[PDB]
Amino acid sequence: NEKSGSCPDMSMPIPPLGICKTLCNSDSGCPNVQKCCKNGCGFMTCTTPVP
Asked: Which of 10, 1, 2, 7 is nearest to 44 (CA)?
């Protein structure tokens, strides 16, 4: 739990394209250094880590 930062609470970016399928299960689930949060179609995807 907790890689470096946290989830970017904003919900600003909203993908209109037909994309409704999770991928990650948590921080450790996401690759590179992306955090696993819910900022799309209500699933668990990777996002940018916020300090």
From this structure: 7
